Scaffold this active site. Sequence first.
Site, PDB file in Angstrom:
ATOM      1  N   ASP A  68       0.837  -1.203   0.000  1.00 32.61           N
ATOM      2  CA  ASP A  68       0.000   0.000   0.000  1.00 32.61           C
ATOM      3  C   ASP A  68       0.877   1.261   0.000  1.00 32.61           C
ATOM      4  O   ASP A  68       1.740   1.410   0.871  1.00 32.61           O
ATOM      5  CB  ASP A  68      -0.854   0.092   1.267  1.00 32.61           C
ATOM      6  CG  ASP A  68      -1.932  -1.012   1.390  1.00 32.61           C
ATOM      7  OD1 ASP A  68      -2.010  -1.922   0.518  1.00 32.61           O
ATOM      8  OD2 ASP A  68      -2.720  -0.918   2.397  1.00 32.61           O
ATOM      9  N   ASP A 122      -2.067   7.668   7.663  1.00 29.53           N
ATOM     10  CA  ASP A 122      -1.533   6.343   8.046  1.00 29.53           C
ATOM     11  C   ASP A 122      -0.314   6.461   8.963  1.00 29.53           C
ATOM     12  O   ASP A 122      -0.208   5.795   9.986  1.00 29.53           O
ATOM     13  CB  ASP A 122      -1.094   5.527   6.826  1.00 29.53           C
ATOM     14  CG  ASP A 122      -2.246   4.905   6.082  1.00 29.53           C
ATOM     15  OD1 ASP A 122      -3.059   4.211   6.733  1.00 29.53           O
ATOM     16  OD2 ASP A 122      -2.332   5.107   4.852  1.00 29.53           O
ATOM     17  N   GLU A 146       0.105  -2.702  10.804  1.00 30.55           N
ATOM     18  CA  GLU A 146       0.003  -2.836   9.359  1.00 30.55           C
ATOM     19  C   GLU A 146       1.092  -2.021   8.660  1.00 30.55           C
ATOM     20  O   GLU A 146       1.592  -2.408   7.605  1.00 30.55           O
ATOM     21  CB  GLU A 146      -1.455  -2.448   8.933  1.00 30.55           C
ATOM     22  CG  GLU A 146      -1.547  -1.401   7.807  1.00 30.55           C
ATOM     23  CD  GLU A 146      -2.616  -1.659   6.804  1.00 30.55           C
ATOM     24  OE1 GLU A 146      -3.466  -0.795   6.499  1.00 30.55           O
ATOM     25  OE2 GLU A 146      -2.548  -2.757   6.297  1.00 30.55           O
ATOM     26  N   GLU A 147       1.403  -0.865   9.228  1.00 28.25           N
ATOM     27  CA  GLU A 147       2.333   0.079   8.614  1.00 28.25           C
ATOM     28  C   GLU A 147       3.821  -0.262   8.788  1.00 28.25           C
ATOM     29  O   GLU A 147       4.693   0.448   8.244  1.00 28.25           O
ATOM     30  CB  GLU A 147       2.103   1.502   9.160  1.00 28.25           C
ATOM     31  CG  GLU A 147       0.664   2.021   9.118  1.00 28.25           C
ATOM     32  CD  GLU A 147      -0.034   1.802   7.770  1.00 28.25           C
ATOM     33  OE1 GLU A 147       0.606   2.021   6.723  1.00 28.25           O
ATOM     34  OE2 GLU A 147      -1.232   1.417   7.777  1.00 28.25           O
ATOM     35  N   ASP A 182      -4.426  -2.115  12.959  1.00 34.15           N
ATOM     36  CA  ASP A 182      -4.475  -1.322  11.734  1.00 34.15           C
ATOM     37  C   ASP A 182      -4.791   0.085  12.193  1.00 34.15           C
ATOM     38  O   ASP A 182      -5.918   0.361  12.563  1.00 34.15           O
ATOM     39  CB  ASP A 182      -5.568  -1.841  10.806  1.00 34.15           C
ATOM     40  CG  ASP A 182      -5.659  -1.068   9.520  1.00 34.15           C
ATOM     41  OD1 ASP A 182      -4.847  -0.155   9.254  1.00 34.15           O
ATOM     42  OD2 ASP A 182      -6.529  -1.384   8.721  1.00 34.15           O
ATOM     43  N   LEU A 200      -5.047   2.965  10.821  1.00 29.82           N
ATOM     44  CA  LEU A 200      -6.045   3.663  10.019  1.00 29.82           C
ATOM     45  C   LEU A 200      -6.506   2.839   8.838  1.00 29.82           C
ATOM     46  O   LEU A 200      -5.781   2.629   7.880  1.00 29.82           O
ATOM     47  CB  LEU A 200      -5.529   5.003   9.537  1.00 29.82           C
ATOM     48  CG  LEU A 200      -6.544   5.926   8.851  1.00 29.82           C
ATOM     49  CD1 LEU A 200      -7.663   6.301   9.782  1.00 29.82           C
ATOM     50  CD2 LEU A 200      -5.836   7.193   8.450  1.00 29.82           C
ATOM     51  N   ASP A 201      -7.753   2.393   8.934  1.00 29.20           N
ATOM     52  CA  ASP A 201      -8.392   1.553   7.938  1.00 29.20           C
ATOM     53  C   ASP A 201      -9.255   2.402   7.008  1.00 29.20           C
ATOM     54  O   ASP A 201     -10.051   3.185   7.469  1.00 29.20           O
ATOM     55  CB  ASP A 201      -9.254   0.474   8.621  1.00 29.20           C
ATOM     56  CG  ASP A 201     -10.085  -0.343   7.632  1.00 29.20           C
ATOM     57  OD1 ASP A 201      -9.485  -1.163   6.882  1.00 29.20           O
ATOM     58  OD2 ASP A 201     -11.314  -0.078   7.609  1.00 29.20           O
ATOM     59  N   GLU A 227      -6.872  -7.186  10.875  1.00 33.86           N
ATOM     60  CA  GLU A 227      -8.139  -6.835  10.256  1.00 33.86           C
ATOM     61  C   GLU A 227      -9.158  -7.937  10.462  1.00 33.86           C
ATOM     62  O   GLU A 227     -10.138  -7.759  11.183  1.00 33.86           O
ATOM     63  CB  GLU A 227      -7.947  -6.539   8.772  1.00 33.86           C
ATOM     64  CG  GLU A 227      -7.118  -5.292   8.510  1.00 33.86           C
ATOM     65  CD  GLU A 227      -6.849  -5.008   7.032  1.00 33.86           C
ATOM     66  OE1 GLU A 227      -6.727  -5.965   6.235  1.00 33.86           O
ATOM     67  OE2 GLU A 227      -6.715  -3.817   6.659  1.00 33.86           O
TER      68      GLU A 227
HETATM   69  K     K Z   1      -3.337   0.450   4.062  1.00 33.84           K
HETATM   70 MN    MN Z   2      -4.418   0.921   7.408  1.00 37.18          MN
HETATM   71 MN    MN Z   3      -7.409  -1.780   6.755  1.00 37.46          MN
END
Ligand code: K
Ligand code: MN
Ligand code: MN
Lengths: 325, 319, 301, 326
Positions: free
Chosen positions: A57, A63, A86-87, A107, A109-110, A273
């Site tokens: 991503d 994020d 996630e990041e 996560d 920021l989804d 997630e």
């Molecule tokens: K993402």
């Molecule tokens: Mn995210």
């Molecule tokens: Mn997400």
Amino acid sequence: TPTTLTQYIIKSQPPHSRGDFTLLMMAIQTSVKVIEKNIRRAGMKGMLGYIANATGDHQAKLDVISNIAFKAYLLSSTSVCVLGSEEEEQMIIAESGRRGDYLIFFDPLDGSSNIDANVSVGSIWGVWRLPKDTTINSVEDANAVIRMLKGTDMVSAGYAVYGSATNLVLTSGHGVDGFTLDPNIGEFILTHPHISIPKKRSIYSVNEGNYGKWEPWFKEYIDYLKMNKTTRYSARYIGSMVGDIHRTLLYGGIFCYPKDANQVEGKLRLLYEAAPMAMIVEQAGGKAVGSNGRILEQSITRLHQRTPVYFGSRQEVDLCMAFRD
Amino acid sequence: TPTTLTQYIIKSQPPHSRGDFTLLMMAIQTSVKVIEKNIRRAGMKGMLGYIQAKLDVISNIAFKAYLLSSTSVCVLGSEEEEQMIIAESGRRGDYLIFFDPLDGSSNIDANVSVGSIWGVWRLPKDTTINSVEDANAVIRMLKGTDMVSAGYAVYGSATNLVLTSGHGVDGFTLDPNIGEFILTHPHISIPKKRSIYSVNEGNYGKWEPWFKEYIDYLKMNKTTRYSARYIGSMVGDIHRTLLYGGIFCYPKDANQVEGKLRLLYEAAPMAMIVEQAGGKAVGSNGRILEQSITRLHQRTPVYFGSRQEVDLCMAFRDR
Amino acid sequence: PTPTTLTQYIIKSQPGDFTLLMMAIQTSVKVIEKNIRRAGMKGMLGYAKLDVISNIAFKAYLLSSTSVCVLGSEEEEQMIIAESGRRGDYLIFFDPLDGSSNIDANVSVGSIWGVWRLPVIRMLKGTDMVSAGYAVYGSATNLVLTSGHGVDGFTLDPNIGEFILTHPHISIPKKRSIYSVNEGNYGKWEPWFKEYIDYLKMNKTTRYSARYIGSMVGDIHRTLLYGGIFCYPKDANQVEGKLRLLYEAAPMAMIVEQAGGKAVGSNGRILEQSITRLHQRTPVYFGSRQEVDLCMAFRDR
Amino acid sequence: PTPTTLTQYIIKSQPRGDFTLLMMAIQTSVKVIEKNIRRAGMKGMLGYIAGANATGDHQAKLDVISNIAFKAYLLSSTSVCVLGSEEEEQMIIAESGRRGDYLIFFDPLDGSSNIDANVSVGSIWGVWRLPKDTTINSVEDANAVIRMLKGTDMVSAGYAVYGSATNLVLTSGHGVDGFTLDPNIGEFILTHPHISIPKKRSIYSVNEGNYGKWEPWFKEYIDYLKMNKTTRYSARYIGSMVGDIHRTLLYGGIFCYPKDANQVEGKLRLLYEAAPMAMIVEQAGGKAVGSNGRILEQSITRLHQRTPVYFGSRQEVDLCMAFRDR
Ligand SMILES: [K+]
Ligand SMILES: [Mn+2]
Ligand SMILES: [Mn+2]
Ligand SMILES: [K+]
Ligand SMILES: [K+]
Ligand SMILES: [K+]
Ligand SMILES: [Mn+2]
Ligand SMILES: [Mn+2]
Ligand SMILES: [Mn+2]
Ligand SMILES: [Mn+2]
């Protein structure tokens, strides 16, 4: 005097408990409030769009800010030993004197490709508790430990929805409760106690733009929802997993991210997630499955592992899985 | 010292202009802020239904209160009211305003975005509205092409206010610390082409054959891959459409053969905004804005968005 | 852009009861602040009801915290015991809203608390107090506190409802030419104190400035930050004094002392005074150590 | 449910919309300043700039920010021809065709040496209307025009108080009305309609730290308030002119900034402190005088002119002036 999330949690833990989980949920609350603050004013503070991750991503500026917030507060909480975002490629270990019992995967920021259009976004977290004897002292140790965990060991899970109101929904294995941020006091107030997802509801949520790349059985299922003589279905897809799952929990329905001809292993990530959302959905009375039964029963092989999802009202998911067979 | 909506509008009007439009936009701003306030705390103040339509009422009350005290309005028409309302004599300006005070109200309980929509007409040159009869006569001799201004608000994680006065579209964002709308999205230009479509595919079965064909093409064509998004809030979906590009459709139904969306306070305002942003906005027989207004709660289908995406859609309608 | 919260600061300060206590106090302060800011539109002004609302808030959150065994409020005659399964180690005494007859005129107000720890509570000394603090409700919302290792000041960020560290290691200046007292009462003062005040005005050497908001928390906060002196002396009416020892004078005294100032009553340190009764009173002479010394020099001839 | 805003109140009050636009600009300014004050501690805006204004005040950072705000919004309002700030030496002319009829003189932040201690502060403004067939095209023109004006020509005046609540009090020559900021909607709501200052109240407000430098008659007056056998007085001095005057209007009492042995012409400035506050005090039913009668009757010679003040309850001010004439 309304009932705060903090009070609710203090009450939930046994008489004169350890207090680690309370401190953890403070850190999460503060993070969520910081992120909310930033989102509400992003347009004026130049934080709309993208910077000039491990899942490939390209990141929005929010994020990064979100990730920074979650890490800062969770690590200072003294309740975490390991965190996985996630990041980030790697898991992060808390320093030795500052190291609690919780492994948290989040996560931060989804839906970050929704922000520029003011469509809802969220944050998701899953909490495991370090197995009884074991001690995580490095990234190697942590990678070994996650491999011997399952969603069925998850002690708590939750998400936040950043919309017109700011919601924080969570479970600790004894149902689901929903809270709403009171901006006048910066506390989360209990507003949606004992969230129960209806057993049946005619609402389906999926990106039909991908019709062509789906498996035949799932094309069949979707066509049935549209063409059957008995019951009319309504379609809703915000495109924010948190937004869509929140609507699914409250209204009922089904939410699908099926197998793709590209993403043959799936789009959604298991640790931060799919599994947290699965524990919430199950605890609300719904059903949450992937390619081979319960998401929570899947073995974790790697931090950024993926899975498809079919989540929601028990009977809607049953109908969906009937087409697969 | 950022640029407020109010200062932007003052600047937009000619040297020593009348001031009615500025006062109108104050009333609209205050209303939007009151509604936003109520939505953000609805859960704690019992206005949500957990265990449906109190925020509609509160919204409507707000818009009416501020608009009528503004001294800029002669007639108002709300989605929540059967009849139009006349402002009292000598508290009576030149604007007719038609508004949806809360769009998507069945979204609120699930924290899905909602909005408010308004279209502003200016009382024709020789006309004087003194009653509901007069007003019903006047609207019948108006078109969307006479609309002087239009706008919406989006109530989401930020609070947006987008508007046009026939010289493009500009987007503002509420600064909650000072209760002013700050210019954040100037000269909104909707892309000519973008592979995003927005429609309720739950209704596939009830659509006309040509539109089923169009949707099937978006999914099955060899050339370009489309993404689907449907929030189910017209304001939320249109806002995404203006900023990202794409198409937004509420087609003819086997039930609603005249359409779902209302012409005066939903379709026509959104049409003027879409057109001003560089997009295309049509119904069953060309431009929404060229349609004749017969009645306050008249309906129409809509096909709105990126000019080429709408062109593609209309190409399928050729029988 | 992730600032230091009061909660984090406290978590860091300890080697969990005290953290939970300070959560309860934060929430209470935020609830009270909320109510004060909008009191005019919600009918809570006169033109006090906010005393009652404040007291209700503090009690609710402190009792649910699981960190308190006993609480004593200025608004209550009797002390209150926490229920048995929900009973921590802290005794807390608080003024939930100080200066409540100021609110109608938008003059600052505050909340004050003193925390003792238990290892029946017939006598305590301020020198046993483990923590103390106040909040100031003004144009910003401040929360100042100590745990016997200095004073630190926080400011409410209304955008996130957290208290942010803004005034670390508050040190009250040793000397500063500001005095704070109600000179309307000149006539009823003791001779030595009239003499002191006259000296501040008439002396050839150093010019003094006068400030009296009339809110103890407002005036003490200005005293801690700017330096100076704050006095509620003996009166011909209130011969025992105006300020209460347990939930006003002793908490403020611990803060003043921890900031490097001096805090005395009729017979030395406030914190050394024996507590005989809940609503016991005392005069106060608080502030910059040399300004208080000067004051006490007039008392001793 | 839908409360009465300051904007609505003003719209009602007028029969042209220039005054409405002016009061919008003032409201926005006041909200911007309030925003900044509430978070000053975290945004590094406590204290002072490192390098004094036209009256010799070393400036707080919030003085500069406040001044910037007021100017920005008032000039874009299209209602102003001239503005004069405490923080500027010269008056400023609005650009031609962005130029209304109002001359406005303001103290964008009053009490700026209170902020670091979270003590109340305020903003003050006085509004004159350009005389019939006068045209201001430069700083020279403006200086000529102010010289032929009096406080009795002032069309409107007001202040804001930045405290635990945010107040905005104003008059247009038909009494005084007080508003309170609703932070949830960023509108000022009518909360204190028809403010009437009591004729008598035993509260005096002055800096007694300056006793030694006062005139003998004023020392005598203050000593009387303390030593007289009949009536007991209470003393209050926040040290913010707006805070103290707001308490004076609501509770009654007296507020004094007398002649000094240093400031022999006075501390307070006539155009943007004393005269606006004087019009508000008079409209509330009180009395507001300087060294030689009514502040509003004083001739304006210069933008940063000064005056002492004796303001408040009509009988308390009468008592004060009785000591001057003895
Ligand atoms: K993402
Ligand atoms: Mn995210
Ligand atoms: Mn997400
Ligand atoms: K409808
Ligand atoms: K009290
Ligand atoms: K100054
Ligand atoms: Mn509606
Ligand atoms: Mn009391
Ligand atoms: Mn008290
Ligand atoms: Mn001033």
